RNA sequence: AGCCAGAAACCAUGCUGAUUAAACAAUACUAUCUUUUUUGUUUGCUAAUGUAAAAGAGAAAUUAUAUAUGUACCGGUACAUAAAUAAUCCUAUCACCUUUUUCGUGAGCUGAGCUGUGAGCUAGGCAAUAGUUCUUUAACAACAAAAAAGAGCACAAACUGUAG
RNA sequence: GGAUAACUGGCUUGUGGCUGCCAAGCGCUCCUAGCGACGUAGCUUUUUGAUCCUUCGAUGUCGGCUCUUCCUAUCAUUGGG
RNA sequence: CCAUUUUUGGUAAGCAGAACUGGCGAUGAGGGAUGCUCCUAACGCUUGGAUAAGGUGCCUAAAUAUUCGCUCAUGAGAUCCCAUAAAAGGUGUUGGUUCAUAUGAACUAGCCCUGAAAAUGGAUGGCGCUAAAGCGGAUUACCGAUACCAAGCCAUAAAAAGAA
RNA sequence: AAUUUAAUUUCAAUAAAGCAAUCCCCUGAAAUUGUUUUCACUUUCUCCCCGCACUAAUGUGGGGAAAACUGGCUUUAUUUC
């Protein structure tokens, strides 16, 4: 239960094979990791890739395993690099982008948020090919490179946003945006 | 009611939100006195607002402007007109709400004695990014030639100096009150004094 | 206001030991905002008798203060 | 975009800087110069002990970084102006006609008569705090001088624009008064 | 002064309106210092009194009463639904209503 | 469609409504602006039209 | 970012209307009449009632708000103080009469004395309950009667004609 | 009888009218000061169609006069490049 | 006669003519500001519930919600049917990608801009909105039909069942 | 507001011990239809050297060293700290 609120989307290891036949008595086993909102969606995404890659379809295959993946440490930061193929209005484009997070799932959430925000690209039009941990020295993006410096601080960059109780319509004196 | 009158200092506020928030309350039934109405902000630039007002000025009833729309030039009336836009003024509830709103340029003396309040959700540097262009309504009105600003500025400075003497008097009186209060904590019962210290005052 | 310099990662035990060592809650409470918050918390949770006692004490205080102000004239 | 952007702006030597209340102000040998930055997002700070001024912005974006350089260049000019005084030298060109230059209002307004033989009067008063002097060194030169780089430049430009005439060609009609040389005294 | 109350102020809003559509079965109350769902839930079962003054005497008094109870929320910012024993007047929209501390 | 030949309107539009004047007296709509420098003096005078001559 | 000059364009100025604002101010003279208290307002008429808001209807900085305000110096310098702001402060139910002490303020006499009024302290034993709750009839405003006290123009008609 | 023409209106804008982009040439030399073929993209309803949705128990069918208002795609006048 | 998809003639047409299905017609409640056909959903009379389409700054009922982007427009932009905008550009900003030697090229597509002219005054439905109330996501909460669930009542239909 | 016994790479401390020092939990980079082998990667409010106050900062840019406080693992007990 916890008390925890925001942000959800999960990681699944799915394994499947072609249905056994007289013609082939030892089907090829195919495995993939898939980021999805649930197991049924994860199976469908696996099937879409199985259909695109192989000539296998749900009617001609069998599930060997499907199991949810949990990240090794929830609170230790890693730099995840993700390679995407996405579709524009005209056609197809490739991108490999870098995200600092404690979770691969969080990095995918940032990626979907970026693809939506910077290109107006819909979830349907994205294909994730590999998300993996990248060393600090190796990183291309300057926005991730800046985080990786020796020392970091800010004088508070964010406006207040008090609880509903204290968002009342009238104030007694003029306030300030933030303390110095 | 919630309070006898809410008096609102329009300095630092953005037009739309101040009007919109007032309108829902106004419909609920509070009477609200907007003071310093000239010093409200529109979020467009000076040019952008001038352009919009010029277009508004262009609007007319071709066959007879005597029964046409009104190009209201007072900042209070501009605010009033905008609030009317946010009311169903053709209804009886709307007519009543429209009557309840009071708008005042600068600070009038029956309300200079009175307290003034502000709307924190309508403050410009709360709700508009710092680098964006903007314009004060009185300045905009002056820009499209409808200057009544210099008189208000003269009035405000005169009133503000007198007010400053009032504030120093109020502060002085509070200092003396605090001294008397602190003196008389010894004069009250110990156990009661200790209870009063324990939960604060 | 407070900050204590820390290592790269957390650790719950080392944080607990360091927080106990530096006495940060005490310093926060000593600071004015901590005082405002603890006074509000106590006041809210107080009993009807406690509330009457506070009212009674202020009423006593006002009587004495007015007596001084009259005497002072 | 950037986390931190900074600038360290050269010592104003022998002169009195003040950074209080967003209207950055330097006084010196030739004047006191005032210039607001209240609309800018920067934490301009006076370094003071070793002199210098330090400009810093937190969480900058490329426009803001540019503003830091614009402001530092302005501060450098402000220091230069009060220390040594800005001179805009304007040379008067004419193929034929005499242009009569009467500086009036105690060296504050140049009155111009007879550009292209016009027999009509062009008046240009100076902006606040700036001198319009003449050259004894060479006949056509006009000195526009002051503490503020902007007021002298604007005044000189206004003098040029006021003289310059509308209509027909210009390519062989080179006549007029033009800024030649930006210096200090 | 000697007439001191116990029971607390609120404002009786409209009916439980909808956009261009009307339900008079439910009334909407804004309760004076209540600005959130959790706080509205605190007073959820309470008896409500709408007291009003007449044009002229009835039996012998000029003061009359409609009785109700708050019964379920209508929002997240302190708007609560109250059901009364009969439909209340549109005349009384935006008026003050009285909230008993019982049960 | 457009008119065959172009002419302005007859008469000023700026004196509509071309109704009766409210008050008989020739009321001054606006005074000349005051000048602090000048010595105090009257700005207007009423007189009666007696007739015309040539000079 | 910051600025500047610059057009028969734009808004004022100017000028016209303004029962287009169901708008308003100042001045002059005036209508048995005006003022305070009490009771009432449960042939067309001749005593007479209304509130879209009472219920603690409590609340004085100021530019801001990528920093302010005092105070001391000479718009500038220095030193303080605020900074989750109404997450507050103010606040009021200690009835009675009687014993005793202090202080605010009014009034009469010609700044003092006394008395009245308002506020506190000190000592006493004394109040109520309508049989379980069914609006807490407690605010504002208007009026009629009863007592006590007070100080006129316009229209018309004739005449006019700068009006019709 | 608008179950069906001739009239406005309406859809459409072929046709008419107007603006483009390109660069082979023309423009002494020079693609673009001015032009602009061979192409290709729009806009408009200031033309005429296509049309037959509206009106056939009557919306008076051309032109002129008079008279006013609105547009700009600016012919002149102002400021300009 | 209308819509999707397939479709023939015609430059095109809210034009002429079809196919399959569903509608409308003859039928409506809620949404789409508004509207015969779009979406949700088809209706005895009532009470309560929980939702749909759809929304939740104010008009106008629910969030000035949360969360990450993008966006400044001297005519920004705002939801199928739905009421215009293209080729062509842009040293405006944002992501990419290919190349070359922390710098120079070249592309690419997001937004935004020029390209973008018309008749009473004028229209994201209006006000307004830019730390959005815009545009692209995602996260929750709330409001939201006469449909849906539960209950009552009415009639019809069918079924039980009956000749002290 | 909770709650049961399961399931599925959960933890986090507690106080006594060890192990290695960019090394380990990890994660990089490398050498036909298998494994495996190599060196890359932590901290620091430690110290030194150069810049000698050069800072966004109670510091700081560059060069080196230092350690295991810090962290990681193996243990042994411990869960109402």
H helix intervals, chain C: 12-22, 24-30, 32-45, 48-72
- CA D129, distance to chain mean position in Å, is 11
Strands, E, within D47-184: which ranges?
53-58, 86-93, 100-104, 109-113, 121-125, 130-134, 141-146, 176-184
Strands, E, within E1-103: which ranges?
8-15, 27-31, 47-53, 63-73, 79-84, 95-99
Provide DSSP, E3-25: T---SEEEEEEEES-BTTB---S
* Closest listed residue to residue E47, CA positions, set E83, E86, E90, E9: E83
Distances from the Cα of E65 to the Cα of B124, E46, E48, angstroms: 46, 17, 10
Under 8 Å CB-to-CB from B46, ≥6 apart: which residues? Answer: B133, B135, B139, B140, B143
Instruction: Tell me how far apart the alpha carbons of residues B27 and E30 are, in angstroms, rounded to a whole number.
Output: 13
Q: How far is the CA of A86 from the C1' of I19 (A)?
A: 39
CB-CB contact of D101 with D112 (8 Å): yes
Provide the b/e sequence for C11-31 (b: ≥16 CB within 10 Å): eeeeeeeeeeeeeeeeeeeee
CB-CB contact of B52 with B121 (8 Å): no
Q: How far is the CA of D25 from the C1' of I1 (A)?
A: 81
3-state secondary structure of B54: helix
Instruction: Tell me how far apart the alpha carbons of residues C11 and C17 are, in angstroms, rounded to a whole number.
Output: 10
CB atoms within 10 A of CB B107: 19
**Residue at shortest CA–C1' distance from I95:** A118
Under 8 Å CB-to-CB from A109, ≥6 apart: which residues? Answer: A7, A9
- CA A7, distance to chain mean position in Å, is 11
Q: What are phi and psi of E29, to 5 degrees?
A: -120, 130
Instruction: Tell me how far apart the alpha carbons of residues D155 and D130 are, in angstroms, rounded to a whole number.
Output: 8
Instruction: Tell me how far apart the alpha carbons of residues D75 and D68 are, in angstroms, rounded to a whole number.
Output: 10
Q: Do chains B and E meet with 3 or more Cβ pairs nearer than 8 Å?
A: yes
Residues 48-67 of D with CB under 8 A from B: 63
* Closest listed residue to residue D101, CA positions, set D115, D87, D88: D115
Residues 139-198 of B with CB under 8 A from C: 177, 180-181, 183-185, 187-189, 192-193, 195-196, 198
Instruction: Tell me how far apart the alpha carbons of residues D86 and D30 are, in angstroms, rounded to a whole number.
Output: 10
Instruction: Report the chain A residue with the minimal C-alpha distance to residue B20.
Output: A169
Handedness of CA C2, C4, C5, C9 (dihedral sign): negative
CB-CB contact of D124 with D144 (8 Å): no
* Closest listed residue to residue B43, CA positions, set B166, B157, B137, B139: B137
Instruction: Tell me how far apart the alpha carbons of residues E65 and E51 are, in angstroms, rounded to a whole number.
Output: 5
CB atoms within 10 A of CB E87: 12
Instruction: Tell me how far apart the alpha carbons of residues E57 and E6 are, in angstroms, rounded to a whole number.
Output: 27
The resolution, in angstroms to one decimal, equals 5.8
Which residue numbers come right before each break in chain E (C to N over 2.5 Å)? none
Strands laid side by side in the A126-133 sheet: A92-101, A78-87, A126-133
By CB atoms closer than 10 A (0-12, 13-18, 19+), residue D142 is buried
Instruction: Tell me how far apart the alpha carbons of residues D123 and D115 are, in angstroms, rounded to a whole number.
Output: 12
- CA D177, distance to chain mean position in Å, is 17
* β-sheet bridge partners, residue D32: D27
* Closest listed residue to residue A129, CA positions, set A83, A169, A87: A83
Provide the b/e sequence for A111-149 (b: ≥16 CB within 10 Å): bbeebeeebebeeeebbbeebeebeeeebeeeebeeeee
Instruction: Tell me how far apart the alpha carbons of residues B89 and B99 are, in angstroms, rounded to a whole number.
Output: 10
Chains touching chain D at 3 or more Cβ pairs under 8 angstroms? A, B
* Closest listed residue to residue E26, CA positions, set E91, E84, E92: E84
DSSP state of E28: E
**Interface residue E41 vs chain A (CB under 8 A):** no
Measured in angstroms, the CA of C60 and the nearest CA of chain B are apart by 6
- CA B11, distance to chain mean position in Å, is 7
Q: Using what technique was this structure determined?
A: cryo-EM
């Amino acid at each position: 239960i916890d008390n925890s609120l925001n942000t959800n989307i999960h990681q699944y290891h799915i394994v499947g094979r072609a249905i056994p036949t007289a013609k082939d008595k030892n089907p090829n086993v195919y495995r993939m990791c898939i980021f999805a909102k649930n197991d049924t969606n994860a199976k469908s995404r696996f099937w879409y890739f199985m259909k695109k890659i192989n000539k296998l379809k749900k009617s001609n295959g069998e599930l060997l395993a499907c199991e949810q993946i949990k990240e090794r440490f929830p609170l230790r930061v890693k730099n995840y690099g993700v390679l995407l193929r996405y579709d524009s209005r005209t056609g197809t484009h490739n991108m490999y982008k870098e995200f600092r997070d404690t979770t691969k799932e969080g990095a995918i959430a940032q990626l979907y948020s970026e693809m939506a925000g910077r290109h107006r690209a819909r979830a349907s039009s994205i294909n994730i090919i590999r998300i993996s941990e990248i060393s600090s020295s190796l990183v291309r993006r300057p926005h991730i490179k800046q985080l990786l410096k020796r020392r970091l601080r800010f004088p508070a960059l964010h406006l207040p946003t008090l609880q509903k109780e204290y968002r009342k319509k009238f104030a007694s004196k003029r306030p300030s945006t933030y303390r110095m | 009611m919630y309070k006898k009158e809410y008096v609102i200092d329009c300095k630092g506020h953005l037009l739309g939100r101040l009007a919109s928030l007032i309108a829902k309350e106004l419909l609920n039934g509070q009477r609200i006195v907007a003071v310093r109405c000239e010093d409200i902000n529109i979020s467009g630039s000076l040019y952008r607002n001038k352009l919009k007002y010029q277009e508004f000025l262009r609007l007319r009833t071709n066959t007879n402007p005597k029964k046409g729309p009104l190009h209201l030039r007072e900042p209070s009336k501009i605010l009033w007109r905008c609030v009317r836009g946010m009311l169903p003024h053709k209804t009886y509830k709307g007519q009543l709400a429209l009557k309840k709103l009071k708008v005042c340029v600068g600070m009038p003396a029956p309300y200079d004695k009175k307290k003034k309040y502000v709307l924190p959700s309508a403050l410009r540097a709360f709700r508009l990014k710092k680098h964006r262009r903007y314009c004060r309504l009185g300045t905009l009105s002056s820009r499209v030639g409808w200057n009544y600003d210099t008189l208000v500025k003269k009035n405000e400075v005169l009133r503000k100096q007198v007010s400053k003497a009032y504030y120093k008097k109020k502060v002085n009186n509070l200092n003396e009150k605090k001294e008397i209060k602190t003196e008389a904590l010894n004069l009250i019962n110990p156990e009661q004094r200790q209870v009063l210290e324990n939960f604060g005052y | 206001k407070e900050r204590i310099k820390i290592n790269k990662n957390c650790k719950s035990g080392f944080l607990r030991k360091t927080v106990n060592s530096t006495k940060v809650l005490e310093e926060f409470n000593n600071s004015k905002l901590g005082k405002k918050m603890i006074i509000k918390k106590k006041r809210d949770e107080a009993t009807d008798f406690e509330r009457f006692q506070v009212y009674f004490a202020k009423r006593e205080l006002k009587k004495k203060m007015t007596t001084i102000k009259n005497k002072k004239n | 975009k950037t986390i931190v952007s900074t600038q360290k702006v050269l010592i104003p030597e022998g002169v009195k800087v003040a950074i209080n209340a967003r209207k950055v102000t330097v006084s010196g040998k030739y004047g006191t110069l005032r210039r607001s930055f209240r609309h800018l997002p920067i934490d301009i700070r006076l370094n003071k002990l070793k002199k210098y001024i330090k400009v810093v912005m937190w969480f900058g974006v490329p426009d803001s970084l540019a503003c830091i350089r614009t402001v530092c260049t302005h501060l450098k000019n402000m220091f230069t102006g009060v220390t040594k005084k800005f001179l805009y030298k304007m040379r008067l060109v004419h193929a034929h006609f005499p242009i009569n230059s009467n500086i009036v209002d105690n060296n504050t307004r140049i009155e111009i008569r007879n550009y292209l033989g016009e027999k009509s009067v062009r008046f240009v008063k100076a902006l606040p705090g700036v001198v319009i002097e003449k050259s004894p060194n060479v006949k056509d030169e006009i000195y526009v001088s002051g503490a503020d780089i902007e007021n002298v430049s604007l005044t000189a430009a206004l003098i040029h624009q006021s003289v310059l005439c509308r209509n027909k060609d210009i390519r062989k009609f080179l006549d007029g008064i033009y800024v030649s040389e930006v210096t200090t005294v | 002064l000697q007439a001191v109350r116990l029971y607390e102020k609120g404002v009786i809003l409209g009916y439980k309106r909808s956009q261009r559509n009307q339900d008079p079965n439910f009334t909407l109350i804004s309760i004076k210092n209540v600005n959130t769902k959790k706080h509205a839930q605190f007073y959820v079962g309470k008896r409500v009194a709408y007291v009003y003054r007449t044009t002229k005497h009835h039996d012998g008094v000029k003061i009359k009463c409609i009785w109700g109870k708050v019964c379920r929320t209508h929002g997240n910012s302190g708007v609560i639904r109250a059901k009364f024993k009969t439909h209340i007047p549109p005349k009384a929209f935006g008026d003050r209503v009285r909230i008993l501390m019982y049960p | 469609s457009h008119r065959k030949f172009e002419r302005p309107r007859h008469g000023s539009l700026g004196f509509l409504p071309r109704k009766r004047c409210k008050r008989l007296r020739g009321k001054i709509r606006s005074f000349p602006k005051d000048d602090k420098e000048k010595p105090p003096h009257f700005t207007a005078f009423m007189g009666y039209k007696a007739g015309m001559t040539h000079i």
